[PDB]
Amino acid sequence: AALVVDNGSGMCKAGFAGDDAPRAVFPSIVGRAQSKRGILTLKYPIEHGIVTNWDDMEKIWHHTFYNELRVAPEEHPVLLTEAPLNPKANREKMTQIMFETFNTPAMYVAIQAVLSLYASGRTTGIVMDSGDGVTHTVPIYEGYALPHAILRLDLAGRDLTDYLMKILTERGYSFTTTAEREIVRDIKEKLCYVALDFEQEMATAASSSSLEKSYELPDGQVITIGNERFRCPEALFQPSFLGMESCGIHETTFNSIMKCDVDIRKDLYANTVLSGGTTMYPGIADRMQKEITALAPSTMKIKIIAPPERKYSVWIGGSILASLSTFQQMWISKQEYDESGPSIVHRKCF
Amino acid sequence: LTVPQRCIGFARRRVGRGGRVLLDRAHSDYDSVFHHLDLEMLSSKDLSQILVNIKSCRWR
Amino acid sequence: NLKTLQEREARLRLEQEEAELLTYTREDAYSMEYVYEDVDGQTEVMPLWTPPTPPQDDSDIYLDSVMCLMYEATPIPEAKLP
Amino acid sequence: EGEVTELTPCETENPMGGYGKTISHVIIGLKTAKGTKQLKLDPSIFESLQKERVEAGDVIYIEANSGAVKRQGRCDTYATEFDLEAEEYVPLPKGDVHKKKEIIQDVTLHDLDVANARPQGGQDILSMMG
Amino acid sequence: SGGVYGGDEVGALVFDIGSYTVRAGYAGEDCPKVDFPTAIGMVYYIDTNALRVPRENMEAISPLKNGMVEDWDSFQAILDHTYKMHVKSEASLHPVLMSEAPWNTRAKREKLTELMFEHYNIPAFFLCKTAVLTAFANGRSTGLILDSGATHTTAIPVHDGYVLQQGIVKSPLAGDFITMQCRELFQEMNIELVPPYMIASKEAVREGSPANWKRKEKLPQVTRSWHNYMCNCVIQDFQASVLQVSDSTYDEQVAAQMPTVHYEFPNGYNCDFGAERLKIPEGLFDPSNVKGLSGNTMLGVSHVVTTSVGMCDIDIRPGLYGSVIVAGGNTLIQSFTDRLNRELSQKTPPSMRLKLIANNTTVERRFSSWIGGSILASLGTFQQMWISKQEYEEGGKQCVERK
Amino acid sequence: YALLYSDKKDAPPLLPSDTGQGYRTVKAKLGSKKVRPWKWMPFTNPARKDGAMFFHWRRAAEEGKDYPFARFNKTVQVPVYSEQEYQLYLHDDAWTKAETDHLFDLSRRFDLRFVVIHDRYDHQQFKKRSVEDLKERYYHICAKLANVRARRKEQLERLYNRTPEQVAEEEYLLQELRKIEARKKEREKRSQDLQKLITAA
Amino acid sequence: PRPKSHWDYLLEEMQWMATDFAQERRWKVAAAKKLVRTVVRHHEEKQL
Amino acid sequence: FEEWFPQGRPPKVPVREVCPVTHRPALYRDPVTDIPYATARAFKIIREAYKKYITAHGLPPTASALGPGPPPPEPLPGSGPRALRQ
Numbered sequence A: 001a002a003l004v005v006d007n008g009s010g011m012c013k014a015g016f017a018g019d020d021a022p023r024a025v026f027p028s029i030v031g032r033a034q035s036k037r038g039i040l041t042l043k044y045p046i047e048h049g050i051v052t053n054w055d056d057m058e059k060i061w062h063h064t065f066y067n068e069l070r071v072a073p074e075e076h077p078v079l080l081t082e083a084p085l086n087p088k089a090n091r092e093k094m095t096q097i098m099f100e101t102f103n104t105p106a107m108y109v110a111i112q113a114v115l116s117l118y119a120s121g122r123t124t125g126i127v128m129d130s131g132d133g134v135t136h137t138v139p140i141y142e143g144y145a146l147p148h149a150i151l152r153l154d155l156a157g158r159d160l161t162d163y164l165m166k167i168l169t170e171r172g173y174s175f176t177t178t179a180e181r182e183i184v185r186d187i188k189e190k191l192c193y194v195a196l197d198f199e200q201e202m203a204t205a206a207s208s209s210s211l212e213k214s215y216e217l218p219d220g221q222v223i224t225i226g227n228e229r230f231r232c233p234e235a236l237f238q239p240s241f242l243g244m245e246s247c248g249i250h251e252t253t254f255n256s257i258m259k260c261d262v263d264i265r266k267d268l269y270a271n272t273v274l275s276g277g278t279t280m281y282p283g284i285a286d287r288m289q290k291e292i293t294a295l296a297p298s299t300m301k302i303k304i305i306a307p308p309e310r311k312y313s314v315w316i317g318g319s320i321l322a323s324l325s326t327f328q329q330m331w332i333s334k335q336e337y338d339e340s341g342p343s344i345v346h347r348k349c350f
Numbered sequence B: 001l002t003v004p005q006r007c008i009g010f011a012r013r014r015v016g017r018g019g020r021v022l023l024d025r026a027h028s029d030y031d032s033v034f035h036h037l038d039l040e041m042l043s044s045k046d047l048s049q050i051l052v053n054i055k056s057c058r059w060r
Numbered sequence C: 001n002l003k004t005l006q007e008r009e010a011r012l013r014l015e016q017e018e019a020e021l022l023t024y025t026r027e028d029a030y031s032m033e034y035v036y037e038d039v040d041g042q043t044e045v046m047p048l049w050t051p052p053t054p055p056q057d058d059s060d061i062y063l064d065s066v067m068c069l070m071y072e073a074t075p076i077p078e079a080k081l082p
Numbered sequence D: 001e002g003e004v005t006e007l008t009p010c011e012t013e014n015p016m017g018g019y020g021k022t023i024s025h026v027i028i029g030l031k032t033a034k035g036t037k038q039l040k041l042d043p044s045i046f047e048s049l050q051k052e053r054v055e056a057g058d059v060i061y062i063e064a065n066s067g068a069v070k071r072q073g074r075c076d077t078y079a080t081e082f083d084l085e086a087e088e089y090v091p092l093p094k095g096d097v098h099k100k101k102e103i104i105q106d107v108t109l110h111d112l113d114v115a116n117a118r119p120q121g122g123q124d125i126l127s128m129m130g
Numbered sequence E: 001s002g003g004v005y006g007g008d009e010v011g012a013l014v015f016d017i018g019s020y021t022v023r024a025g026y027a028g029e030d031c032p033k034v035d036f037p038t039a040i041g042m043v044y045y046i047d048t049n050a051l052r053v054p055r056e057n058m059e060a061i062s063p064l065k066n067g068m069v070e071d072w073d074s075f076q077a078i079l080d081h082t083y084k085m086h087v088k089s090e091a092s093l094h095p096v097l098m099s100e101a102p103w104n105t106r107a108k109r110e111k112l113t114e115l116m117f118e119h120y121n122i123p124a125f126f127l128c129k130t131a132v133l134t135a136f137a138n139g140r141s142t143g144l145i146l147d148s149g150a151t152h153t154t155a156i157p158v159h160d161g162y163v164l165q166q167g168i169v170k171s172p173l174a175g176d177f178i179t180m181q182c183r184e185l186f187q188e189m190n191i192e193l194v195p196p197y198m199i200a201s202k203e204a205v206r207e208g209s210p211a212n213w214k215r216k217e218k219l220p221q222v223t224r225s226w227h228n229y230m231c232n233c234v235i236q237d238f239q240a241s242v243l244q245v246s247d248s249t250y251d252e253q254v255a256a257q258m259p260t261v262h263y264e265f266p267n268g269y270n271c272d273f274g275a276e277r278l279k280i281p282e283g284l285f286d287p288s289n290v291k292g293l294s295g296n297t298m299l300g301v302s303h304v305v306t307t308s309v310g311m312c313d314i315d316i317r318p319g320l321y322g323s324v325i326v327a328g329g330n331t332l333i334q335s336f337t338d339r340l341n342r343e344l345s346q347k348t349p350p351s352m353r354l355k356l357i358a359n360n361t362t363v364e365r366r367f368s369s370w371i372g373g374s375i376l377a378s379l380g381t382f383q384q385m386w387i388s389k390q391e392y393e394e395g396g397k398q399c400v401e402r403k
Numbered sequence F: 001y002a003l004l005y006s007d008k009k010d011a012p013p014l015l016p017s018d019t020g021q022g023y024r025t026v027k028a029k030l031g032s033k034k035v036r037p038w039k040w041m042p043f044t045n046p047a048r049k050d051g052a053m054f055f056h057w058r059r060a061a062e063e064g065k066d067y068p069f070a071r072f073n074k075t076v077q078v079p080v081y082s083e084q085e086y087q088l089y090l091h092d093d094a095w096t097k098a099e100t101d102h103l104f105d106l107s108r109r110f111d112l113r114f115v116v117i118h119d120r121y122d123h124q125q126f127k128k129r130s131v132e133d134l135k136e137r138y139y140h141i142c143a144k145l146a147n148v149r150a151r152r153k154e155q156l157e158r159l160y161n162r163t164p165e166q167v168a169e170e171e172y173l174l175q176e177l178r179k180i181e182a183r184k185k186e187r188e189k190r191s192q193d194l195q196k197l198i199t200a201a
Numbered sequence G: 001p002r003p004k005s006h007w008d009y010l011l012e013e014m015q016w017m018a019t020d021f022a023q024e025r026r027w028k029v030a031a032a033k034k035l036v037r038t039v040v041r042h043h044e045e046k047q048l
Numbered sequence H: 001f002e003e004w005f006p007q008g009r010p011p012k013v014p015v016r017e018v019c020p021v022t023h024r025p026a027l028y029r030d031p032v033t034d035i036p037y038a039t040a041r042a043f044k045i046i047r048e049a050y051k052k053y054i055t056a057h058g059l060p061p062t063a064s065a066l067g068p069g070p071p072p073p074e075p076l077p078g079s080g081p082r083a084l085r086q
C-alpha cells in the first residue's frame, strides 16, 4: 500500500512497499512535458542530488505517480527520500508540493544513507553512497546520521562517463556526442571494471594484451578497451585523473570516520557499507578494503560489506521501512500538515 | 494515557513548535513500580506505590 | 530447552531496552484535558507548558527570579523605627 | 485474558522415541490493554483451543490451574458498525494479563441448604406439568 | 489551541566561527550540518577534503587570531566557499546570525557588519555573543559559560542574557597548550610523523619497536607551517583518543598502577602511555609545575571560574555558581568535567549551591554556540531585533545600540 | 522520594510523539478532507520600527494578520527629561548632564538592569560609579520628575549595608566558616537545652 | 517593581525553544535507535 | 498440524468509515451507492449524486454539502461498485 519513491539522480526509482525490488525505474530527466529521450528541451533538475527547479520536480512526481505507476497518490502514502545534506527550504517545499498538489494522505522523508543502512541490516557504519551525480559518506550510530560528520564528494557516474568519453576519444573512438555518450555509459556499466593495485595492473596490461577486451557498437563498429578500463573508475580513488583536486572515496570515508565521535569509530570501521550504482564495479570492494586497511590503523578490523543490490539498496531499505509496523506511527498525517504546515516535515524524523 | 492503560511515569504537558503538544517524561524509582501503579490509579511494591506518591495521578 | 529459554529471555530483554512507548495518541490526548484527585478528594487542573502569552495590560510584574535564590518575599510588618 | 496470537514453535519429535513432528509447548500471545505478554502454556491444552472458536483476535478467559479456555468474544476494535451481531464482540481487558480476582460471597446456611436441595442439569427437569 | 505564538523560522543561516573548527547551518535545526576545519590551505582551499590534497604550497592560516578575525580576505573567502559548496543558497536570500566573542572590538564589529551588508547584501543580520548563545543552548539566562576553545579558556558570566564584559578571564590555557605539550612529549620519546598525507603504506610493528613504512614520492611541501598543521591533526587525534585528565592532585603513586592503554601512530608505530598519559592535562587546572614554563603564574580552570565570579557583583554570583555552563572542545576529555566539578566544589565557598549542567555525555558542547544561535533565531519575539538592510542603508550602520 | 522537578531533561527519559499509525483504520478519516494551502508569504512586523519586510510560513487564508508577537514589545517606563528640566531640577555637583544622559540611555537600552548598566558603564568618560549609586541617582531623578509633573523612598545606605556584609560573608575562609557552623550548632544545642528546661518546669 | 519588558518574554520563549530542541534531539535519537533495532531484528527473523 | 493450528495472519483491523456528506461516524451503508452515510439528508444527497452520475458517463462536477473550515473535497471519486438499483 505504502509507496516508496527514491529521488536518485540519473534515474528515478519508485514502486510499492514490501517488494524485493523496484517496479518502475526510468531516467530522472524531464523535457518541456515528456520524460523520455528525444530531441527536446530535456534538463536535469536533480543533477547533484538537490532539486534545482520545482517545476520539473512536480512534473516527474506526477509522471512517476500516474504514468510509470498506475496508483493514485491521494489514496496511498508516499515514502520520499532526501540527500543527507538536503537543505531546509527544499525539504519544506517538497513537503508542501506533496501535500497540496497530489493531496497525499501521509508521507515521510528519510535519509538515503539511513535507508541503505536498513537495507544492509546494520546498526552502525559508514554509508558510502555514490549516486550518479554526487557521492556521500554518512557515518551512522544507532540510526543517527551524525550530520556534522557527513562529508560530500563532488564526483560520480556522470564525471566517470565524461572521463571515459575523453579517454576513448583520445584513443580514436567516436564518443563525442550524447548519442555516443549513451553507448559509453553502457560500456561503463557493463565493461570498465575496477582493478586493485593500478600501479602493477596498468604495467601488466601494457606489457600483455590479455587485458584488451572487444566491444561492439550498435552501428557495427568494433573497438577494444583495455588498460583504460579500470583507469576511468580509478578517478574515484585518485580524482587527479578526472582533473579535480578533491580527496578520493576512501580518503573521504577515512576523514568522515575520524570526524566521528571517539569510542565508537571501531564499530564504524567494522561496518563500512557501500551504496549507489557507482559501486557496481567488480572488485571495488577489495580495493576499498585494502586501501582503508592501509590508511586505517593495522589493529583496526576493517570489514567492507556490499550486497549485490547496491544500485537499489536505498529502495530496498525504503520498502523495509514502509512495511515496518513500528514505522507506521511516524507517518506525517494530513491533519498534522494542515494544522502545522510544511514545517511538520522537520519534526517526526529519525 | 487515554488509549493505553499503563502509567508512563512522571510526565508534564508541554507545547512544541507548530502548535503540537508534547509530553515529556522522567525516570525514578527504577521506572518499574509506576508501571504497576495502574492498579492504584484505576481504582513491598503495594504500599510503596501509595507512599512514593499521594495518588495524584492524572486521570484521562 | 533451558538454553533456548535463556536466549529467548535475553532477546526479549534486549527489546525492552530500546524504547517502551513513543506515541501519544493525538486522537484524544491531544485535545482532552487531564485532572486528578488527591487523597483529600481535591481537584486540580494539569498545567501545560505554553509559550509566553501576549500581555494585554501592564500586569505580569518583573519577578527577577535569579534574585529569589536568597530572598523569598517581603512581609508587611517591619522594625518601624529610624 | 487478552487478544490471542496463537503460534506453535516446532520442536523435535519426542526424544525418548523415534523422530517425526511433535509440539513440546504452545505459546499464546495474550494482548491486554496495558500491554502484551506471551504465555508458554502446556501443549495438552491445544485440544481446548481447537474445541472453542479461538481465532487470532478474540478475548479468551484462561484459568491457571484448570487451564480451560472460555472465549469471551471478539474485540470491539473489529466490531465494524456495518456488522450486525451481538454478544460476540467484547471490549479489550483493562489491566495486566495476569489478574488475581478476589471475590467474596455472603450466603446464609439456608441458602446452601436450598441450593443443595433441588437438582440442576438435564434429567428431563425441563418438564412443566409434573 | 492553535499555537499561534509558538515560533517563527525565517532563514537565519547561523555561522558560528571558531578557531579550531567553523560551524554553520540553517536556523531551527538541532545540529549544524556544516562542520569543517577553519584553517584554509592558502597557496584558497577550505574543506575537509581540499585541505588534504598535496599541491604546490598550500600554506595553512587561521583568519581568527585570539578568537578575533583579522584577515578579512580569508574570512570572506571561507564564507563564500561555505555558502557556495555546503549551503548552495544565494547570499541575499536568507539572514545570518553569526556569533562573536565577548571581547570583539567596536571597529572590528563595524567592519564585520559592513562586510555582511556590502559584499553579500544579506536581507538582515544580527551578531550575538558566543557566551549568550551557549547559555541559550542550555536554556540558562544566568550562568558561567566556561569556554575552553583551542586557543583560550574563559569563564564568561551572563546576567539576564547579557554578558558581563568585565567578568571575563582570558586564560591562555587551551587546546593549543595541550597539543604543544603532546608534541614535546612525542619528540622526547619518539619522532613525530606526518599523517598518511605522506605515508604510502604501513606494516605490522611490535609494541615499542621501531616502525617501518614506505615514503611517497609526491611534492616535498617545503612549507613547514603546513607540516605543523598536519602534525597538530594527529596530536589532537591522540589528545581526544587516549589523553585523560587526572581526578586528584596527581601524585606519582596511583598513575603508575593504573591500567595501560595503547595507540597506533599513522605509520603503525605502537606505543603505550598508561604511565604519563595524564601528565599533560595538569596545567589546565594546576599550571604551577608545567615543564614548559616552570616560572609562570597562571590560573587553572577552577581558579579562572572563581576569579570570573569574584570580579562581578555579589548579587548575581548565586546565579553564576549554581548554573556553571561547561563548553568547548577541551571539556570532552575523559574525567575533565568530574575533575572540574570536584575542584570547584572544594574551592567554592560552602552554603552556595554549585550545579554542573549534565551535557558532557554528547559532543554537542562544541556546537553549543550554534545550537543557541539556531534557538534564538527560531524565536518569534526575536524576529524584530534583526538588523535589516534598511537600517544599514539608511546611514546609521550602528550595531552597538542595536546589536 | 517525591515527584521530580527538571527544567530541560533528565538522563534516560523519553517523550512520546503524536500518532500517525493505522492508515487503514483512519484511511477514510483523513481521505475525506484536504490541506489548507501554506504559502511562503512576506510579512511586515509593525514592531520593526522601519520599512523592512521578511517572510514566514502562513496559510493563504490569513494573508493579513500582520504579526502575532508584535504586542510583546512593551518598552519600560523611563522618563525623558529635557535639558531645561535637568538644569532646573536635576542639577548636581558630582554628576553632569552628559553623565545623566548616558545613564538614562543605558537604562532605556538594558531595561533598568542596573547590573548590566554598571557592567557596560563607560568608566573612562566618567569616573567609577557603584550599582547602588546609579540606582539612587535614577530613583531620585524619577521621583523629582514625578513630583514636578504633578515612587517609594530609595535608601542607598541599605545597599551600602547589604552588599559589603554579604561579600564579607561570601569571603568566609574555610576554617572560620567551619567555626561559624560549629557556633551555630552550639547555639542550637543551647536552644534545645532551654526547651528541655522549660518543658521540665 | 517594574513591568516585564520585551526581553523578559523573549528569554522565556528562548528557554521554551531550548527545552523543545533538547527534547526533540533525544526523540530523534530514540526513534532512530528503535528503527535500526527493529530493522535488524526483522532481518534476523526473516533469516530464521 | 494445519487443522488443529490454522496459523492465519491477524484479522486486519478494518477501516473507520465516515459519512461523506457530514464527516461524522458513518452509521449506515447506502445499498445502491455502496458508500457509508449517517443521516437521511446524507442518503438523499448520495442518491441524487448517484442519479446525476449514472445519467451521463461520469458526473463532471461533484456535489458539495456541509463544507467545514478546511477545503472540502466534495467526494465524487468515492466509487460505488454496486450496479443499477435493480
Ligand SMILES: Nc1ncnc2c1ncn2[C@@H]1O[C@H](COP(=O)(O)OP(=O)(O)O)[C@@H](O)[C@H]1O
Pocket: A007, A008, A009, A010, A011, A012, A049, A130, A131, A132, A133, A134, A156, A157, A158, A188, A189, A190, A276, A277, A278, A279, A280, A281, A311
Ligand atoms: N552496471 C553498473 N555498474 C556501476 N555503476 C553503474 C552501472 N550502471 C549505471 N551505473 C552508474 O551508477 C548510477 C546509479 O544511479 P543511482 O544509484 O540511481 O543514483 P542515486 O544514488 O543518485 O540514486 C547511475 O547513475 C550510473 O551513472
Ligand SMILES: Nc1ncnc2c1ncn2[C@@H]1O[C@H](COP(=O)(O)OP(=O)(O)O)[C@@H](O)[C@H]1O
Pocket: E017, E018, E019, E020, E021, E064, E066, E067, E130, E147, E148, E149, E150, E151, E175, E236, E237, E239, E240, E328, E329, E330, E331, E332, E333, E366, E367
Ligand atoms: N575561538 C573560539 N571560540 C569558541 N570555541 C572555539 C574557539 N576555538 C576553538 N573552539 C572550540 O574548541 C574545540 C577545540 O577542539 P579540541 O578540544 O582540540 O577537540 P577534542 O579535545 O574534543 O579532540 C573546537 O571543537 C571548537 O568548537
